[PDB]
Amino acid sequence: PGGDFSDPVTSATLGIVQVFWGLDKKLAQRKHFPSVNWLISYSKYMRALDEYYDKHFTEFVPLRTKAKEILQEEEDLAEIVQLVGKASLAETDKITLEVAKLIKDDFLQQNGYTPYDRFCPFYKTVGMLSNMIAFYDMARRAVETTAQSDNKITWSIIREHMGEILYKLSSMKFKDPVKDGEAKIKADYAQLLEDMQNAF
Amino acid sequence: PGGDFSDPVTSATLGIVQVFWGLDKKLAQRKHFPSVNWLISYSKYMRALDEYYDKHFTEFVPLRTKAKEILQEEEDLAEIVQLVGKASLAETDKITLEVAKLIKDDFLQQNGYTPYDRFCPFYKTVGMLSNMIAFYDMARRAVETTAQSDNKITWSIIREHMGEILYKLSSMKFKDPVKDGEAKIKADYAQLLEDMQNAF
Amino acid sequence: RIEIFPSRMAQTIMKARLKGAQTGRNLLKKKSDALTLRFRQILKKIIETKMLMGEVMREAAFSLAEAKFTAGDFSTTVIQNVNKAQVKIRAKKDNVAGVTLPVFEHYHEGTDSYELTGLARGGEQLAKLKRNYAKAVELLVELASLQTSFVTLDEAIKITNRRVNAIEHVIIPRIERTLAYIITELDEREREEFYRLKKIQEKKKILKEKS
Amino acid sequence: VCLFLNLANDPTIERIITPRLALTTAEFLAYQCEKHVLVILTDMSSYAEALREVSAAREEVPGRRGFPGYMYTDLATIYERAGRVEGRNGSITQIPILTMPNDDITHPIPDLTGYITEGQIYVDRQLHNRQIYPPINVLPSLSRLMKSAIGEGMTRKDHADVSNQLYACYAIGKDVQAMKAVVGEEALTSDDLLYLEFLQKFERNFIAQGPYENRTVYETLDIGWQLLRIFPKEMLKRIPQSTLSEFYPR
Amino acid sequence: GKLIAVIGDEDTVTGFLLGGIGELNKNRHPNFLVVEKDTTINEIEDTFRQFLNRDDIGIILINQYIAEMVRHALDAHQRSIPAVLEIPSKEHPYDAAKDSILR
């Protein structure tokens, strides 16, 4: 009642169940579907599933450990922007807020009535997550290795030069089940553009 | 720790008892022992003890009236420094923030397992309090009457020059049970030491 | 946006958090008025002395013409012979409401590099053209002292004006709608205790009526 | 004095019959023997726990915060035994002294007496820890029938204006007292320095008076004019010139 | 910042060098720049970048007629040091450039 999770029905249920998909109303006041609040939600089959995950998708457990770190790093800095402002941030934090905004818009948002996002098989899930985190790790080396000395990459030159590549990252959700093997290739075909653009 | 003054056990008790030594949890988290905070604690046997205090320890009553003023003058100024900073503070105000900090570490702090602070007699209590407020009264005397014409120290040259004398005030809680005579004359020793410094 | 659980003790805690935030406005708003009042009076000192240096530099420019009428051309003698500076500045510090203001102070380590300029034709129009321009750099340092105080004040009164409004719009309404949640949730416990205690009294009359 | 004790040992049912006893004798001395009686009721917060205790003895269900629902009627039976009547020269006035729990005015003991009484006097812990007796702050305190009390025939003519000016300068002087902390002792002007020197003498000479000094209402206004004389003219805007011309030059 | 810099004009700098603000350390640069009729807009922009990056320069004097060309370069400079002033020319009187910071 009232969307409050301090309820004798809800709080009694959370002591019994293992998975909790907390739906947020503010994620429904904007059209962000599904509305699962990634901060308060949890699962308890983590240790029970990684024995399945080192057999079929052998790279996915290091991915969610960073993707959950990026989404919490955004929330710890979102309270700074509304009080202090966006102009006073560092460069390792402005790359954090924009990759996490790419995760919330491409990976987390999912239209249920469109013909392609009404069902997403798990190779498409691990596939499009493996490129949005490698892009986060590649943009880390552009800031951390060239740190202070040279007139370096400061991420303002990234967003104007990667405008074709960011449009590839924001369009990975459009892969219908009319292709199965080609979607795994285009996940790496988008990666080879991501491979070379950090060199140039 | 809880239901500070609105709790049926505590609220019914304070309408009956005369003395209330309120132990603070915040002083206990910073390991300030004893954790009796001086703002919400009270005693009501202050009119009944001035007949005893005008007979046996006649120095005491004008000191306890002033020592409670300095402890709140720091409290009303502690909320100033955490908002705007110490940089625009006055000089009659900075002489409160050092002596009140000298009160909270020398006078109010007391170790119950240390073999000399496990029981502090009342001549030792009136003794070290009469020096920490005479130090406050002489330093108030220096800054106020000599102001804006004479080149009098605005507390920055005092705090480094009294570094041996401020060590004598902070080490005054160490005399014991192995003296009473020596402990009494050392308070008069440290008082005549300060009378030469204020003659400068 | 709510913060913590209602206990009858959190209400006194949230009123203490509200009390510091209510006095976090007026203690910081009046700082933002003390900064703006000096910021507005420096701008009047900016505008007044900027039309005052325009008259001094006009007088120094007419002095220049006079010197050239008397004394040849010095547009290569003066330019070539510079080695060290005769007028220098040292940055001093000032403050208003704990905001450190950079300010400039001028001083002359005077070794005159134009001690002998002219000296055969002119040299009387010089050392009063020097006086007309050393008085000009006397004023242009004093104007630049107000320039560097003006430019660092509004970039330090913007960060104070944001800290006031972040309290007024983000922190104070969040505490106040937290405190409204403490009141209605504590009223909902009192009806639960009222319904339980009235039900006991209704059952106590049932056993009394049979017995 | 008709002093009525009631300790914490003697029964709690006797706390209910105690102000009914005290106001019965204060209705016989006032407008049955025709004299002015001042009734002091303390502690009026300790009355209501006696009212709460006999309520649960009758197996009655407690209302808001444990206190009974008829407490606004029960406080009305003893607060409204006051005032003065038509054909009788006596009167009766009440000062019911009560302590608010956890300094909360939203509590029903200082709230239900606020709907029915005519102004409040505040004893604060801010002035008490500053060693000021009596620790009464006058900014949130108010007397709703003080316009009627004072006047020309009643105390003297300047009472309505010296209290209006002493309240104004204390409010302004409290605001500049924080700017000495956060802005600077040098940045404040000469007039704001004068409000600083007013507040240091207002809290120590006007409010602080000691537990045995009986200042009359004429000695009170003379101390109030000494603290207004430190200000020059044309700042005392609450006092008209018809009374400011006499009392200021002295 | 201990030096005063001047970009000025031809008649402007020879009055200010007579004031005593010129200084030549032969390693780094001269602290002034005479701007004549046949110098490009780029050369004014490099020396403006020189004086802003130099540590000893605390004040930058410049005529506003010369500052009208490098106006895009000095509208981006929003620091407290070095101060930049616009002084009037022999021909060109006055008004613009700091009130962009305050309208």
PDB file of N, CA, C and O in Angstrom, chain D residues 189-215:
ATOM      1  N   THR D 189      29.382  47.258  10.736  1.00  0.00           N
ATOM      2  CA  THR D 189      29.451  48.713  10.762  1.00  0.00           C
ATOM      3  C   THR D 189      29.418  49.233  12.200  1.00  0.00           C
ATOM      4  O   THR D 189      29.468  48.475  13.171  1.00  0.00           O
ATOM      5  N   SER D 190      29.336  50.558  12.343  1.00  0.00           N
ATOM      6  CA  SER D 190      29.326  51.167  13.669  1.00  0.00           C
ATOM      7  C   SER D 190      27.973  51.000  14.347  1.00  0.00           C
ATOM      8  O   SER D 190      27.900  50.863  15.574  1.00  0.00           O
ATOM      9  N   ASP D 191      26.889  51.021  13.568  1.00  0.00           N
ATOM     10  CA  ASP D 191      25.564  50.848  14.150  1.00  0.00           C
ATOM     11  C   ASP D 191      25.304  49.399  14.537  1.00  0.00           C
ATOM     12  O   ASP D 191      24.634  49.139  15.542  1.00  0.00           O
ATOM     13  N   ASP D 192      25.828  48.446  13.763  1.00  0.00           N
ATOM     14  CA  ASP D 192      25.680  47.041  14.125  1.00  0.00           C
ATOM     15  C   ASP D 192      26.581  46.669  15.293  1.00  0.00           C
ATOM     16  O   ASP D 192      26.308  45.693  16.000  1.00  0.00           O
ATOM     17  N   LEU D 193      27.662  47.423  15.504  1.00  0.00           N
ATOM     18  CA  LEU D 193      28.462  47.249  16.711  1.00  0.00           C
ATOM     19  C   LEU D 193      27.705  47.742  17.936  1.00  0.00           C
ATOM     20  O   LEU D 193      27.921  47.255  19.052  1.00  0.00           O
ATOM     21  N   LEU D 194      26.804  48.705  17.741  1.00  0.00           N
ATOM     22  CA  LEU D 194      26.035  49.247  18.853  1.00  0.00           C
ATOM     23  C   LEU D 194      24.942  48.278  19.288  1.00  0.00           C
ATOM     24  O   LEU D 194      24.583  48.225  20.469  1.00  0.00           O
ATOM     25  N   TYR D 195      24.403  47.502  18.343  1.00  0.00           N
ATOM     26  CA  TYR D 195      23.460  46.444  18.695  1.00  0.00           C
ATOM     27  C   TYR D 195      24.163  45.295  19.404  1.00  0.00           C
ATOM     28  O   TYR D 195      23.539  44.556  20.174  1.00  0.00           O
ATOM     29  N   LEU D 196      25.459  45.116  19.137  1.00  0.00           N
ATOM     30  CA  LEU D 196      26.242  44.114  19.851  1.00  0.00           C
ATOM     31  C   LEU D 196      26.420  44.503  21.311  1.00  0.00           C
ATOM     32  O   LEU D 196      26.341  43.658  22.209  1.00  0.00           O
ATOM     33  N   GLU D 197      26.672  45.788  21.564  1.00  0.00           N
ATOM     34  CA  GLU D 197      26.896  46.248  22.929  1.00  0.00           C
ATOM     35  C   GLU D 197      25.577  46.389  23.681  1.00  0.00           C
ATOM     36  O   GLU D 197      25.559  46.373  24.916  1.00  0.00           O
ATOM     37  N   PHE D 198      24.463  46.486  22.952  1.00  0.00           N
ATOM     38  CA  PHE D 198      23.149  46.489  23.587  1.00  0.00           C
ATOM     39  C   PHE D 198      22.801  45.110  24.131  1.00  0.00           C
ATOM     40  O   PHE D 198      22.315  44.980  25.259  1.00  0.00           O
ATOM     41  N   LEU D 199      23.036  44.067  23.328  1.00  0.00           N
ATOM     42  CA  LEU D 199      22.617  42.716  23.692  1.00  0.00           C
ATOM     43  C   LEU D 199      23.439  42.165  24.851  1.00  0.00           C
ATOM     44  O   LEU D 199      22.946  41.349  25.639  1.00  0.00           O
ATOM     45  N   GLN D 200      24.694  42.600  24.972  1.00  0.00           N
ATOM     46  CA  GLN D 200      25.527  42.156  26.084  1.00  0.00           C
ATOM     47  C   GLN D 200      25.060  42.773  27.396  1.00  0.00           C
ATOM     48  O   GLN D 200      25.208  42.176  28.467  1.00  0.00           O
ATOM     49  N   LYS D 201      24.486  43.977  27.332  1.00  0.00           N
ATOM     50  CA  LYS D 201      23.974  44.611  28.541  1.00  0.00           C
ATOM     51  C   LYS D 201      22.493  44.323  28.753  1.00  0.00           C
ATOM     52  O   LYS D 201      21.992  44.486  29.869  1.00  0.00           O
ATOM     53  N   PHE D 202      21.772  43.917  27.706  1.00  0.00           N
ATOM     54  CA  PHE D 202      20.362  43.574  27.875  1.00  0.00           C
ATOM     55  C   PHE D 202      20.207  42.261  28.630  1.00  0.00           C
ATOM     56  O   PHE D 202      19.336  42.130  29.497  1.00  0.00           O
ATOM     57  N   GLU D 203      21.045  41.277  28.312  1.00  0.00           N
ATOM     58  CA  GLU D 203      20.917  39.968  28.942  1.00  0.00           C
ATOM     59  C   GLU D 203      21.545  39.947  30.328  1.00  0.00           C
ATOM     60  O   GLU D 203      21.307  39.016  31.105  1.00  0.00           O
ATOM     61  N   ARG D 204      22.360  40.947  30.657  1.00  0.00           N
ATOM     62  CA  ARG D 204      23.050  40.957  31.940  1.00  0.00           C
ATOM     63  C   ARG D 204      22.510  41.992  32.920  1.00  0.00           C
ATOM     64  O   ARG D 204      22.758  41.862  34.123  1.00  0.00           O
ATOM     65  N   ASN D 205      21.790  43.001  32.453  1.00  0.00           N
ATOM     66  CA  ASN D 205      21.262  44.016  33.362  1.00  0.00           C
ATOM     67  C   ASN D 205      19.742  44.051  33.396  1.00  0.00           C
ATOM     68  O   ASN D 205      19.167  44.314  34.453  1.00  0.00           O
ATOM     69  N   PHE D 206      19.078  43.799  32.269  1.00  0.00           N
ATOM     70  CA  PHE D 206      17.622  43.797  32.245  1.00  0.00           C
ATOM     71  C   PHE D 206      17.050  42.431  32.601  1.00  0.00           C
ATOM     72  O   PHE D 206      16.236  42.320  33.522  1.00  0.00           O
ATOM     73  N   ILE D 207      17.465  41.388  31.886  1.00  0.00           N
ATOM     74  CA  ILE D 207      16.911  40.059  32.118  1.00  0.00           C
ATOM     75  C   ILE D 207      17.497  39.446  33.385  1.00  0.00           C
ATOM     76  O   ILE D 207      16.760  39.029  34.285  1.00  0.00           O
ATOM     77  N   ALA D 208      18.823  39.403  33.483  1.00  0.00           N
ATOM     78  CA  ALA D 208      19.467  38.839  34.663  1.00  0.00           C
ATOM     79  C   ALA D 208      19.334  39.792  35.841  1.00  0.00           C
ATOM     80  O   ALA D 208      19.807  40.930  35.787  1.00  0.00           O
ATOM     81  N   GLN D 209      18.685  39.329  36.910  1.00  0.00           N
ATOM     82  CA  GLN D 209      18.380  40.198  38.034  1.00  0.00           C
ATOM     83  C   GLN D 209      18.660  39.594  39.403  1.00  0.00           C
ATOM     84  O   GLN D 209      18.630  40.327  40.395  1.00  0.00           O
ATOM     85  N   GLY D 210      18.931  38.298  39.499  1.00  0.00           N
ATOM     86  CA  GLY D 210      19.199  37.696  40.781  1.00  0.00           C
ATOM     87  C   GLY D 210      17.930  37.294  41.505  1.00  0.00           C
ATOM     88  O   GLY D 210      16.868  37.894  41.324  1.00  0.00           O
ATOM     89  N   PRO D 211      18.019  36.265  42.353  1.00  0.00           N
ATOM     90  CA  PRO D 211      16.807  35.690  42.953  1.00  0.00           C
ATOM     91  C   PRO D 211      16.217  36.480  44.111  1.00  0.00           C
ATOM     92  O   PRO D 211      15.280  35.983  44.744  1.00  0.00           O
ATOM     93  N   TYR D 212      16.708  37.678  44.429  1.00  0.00           N
ATOM     94  CA  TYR D 212      16.187  38.415  45.574  1.00  0.00           C
ATOM     95  C   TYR D 212      15.943  39.890  45.287  1.00  0.00           C
ATOM     96  O   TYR D 212      15.602  40.637  46.210  1.00  0.00           O
ATOM     97  N   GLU D 213      16.094  40.328  44.044  1.00  0.00           N
ATOM     98  CA  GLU D 213      15.975  41.735  43.691  1.00  0.00           C
ATOM     99  C   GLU D 213      14.575  41.988  43.146  1.00  0.00           C
ATOM    100  O   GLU D 213      14.222  41.488  42.073  1.00  0.00           O
ATOM    101  N   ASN D 214      13.780  42.750  43.892  1.00  0.00           N
ATOM    102  CA  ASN D 214      12.382  43.014  43.567  1.00  0.00           C
ATOM    103  C   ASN D 214      12.326  44.374  42.879  1.00  0.00           C
ATOM    104  O   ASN D 214      12.105  45.399  43.528  1.00  0.00           O
ATOM    105  N   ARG D 215      12.516  44.378  41.565  1.00  0.00           N
ATOM    106  CA  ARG D 215      12.375  45.594  40.777  1.00  0.00           C
ATOM    107  C   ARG D 215      10.896  45.871  40.558  1.00  0.00           C
ATOM    108  O   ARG D 215      10.172  45.016  40.040  1.00  0.00           O
TER     109      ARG D 215
END
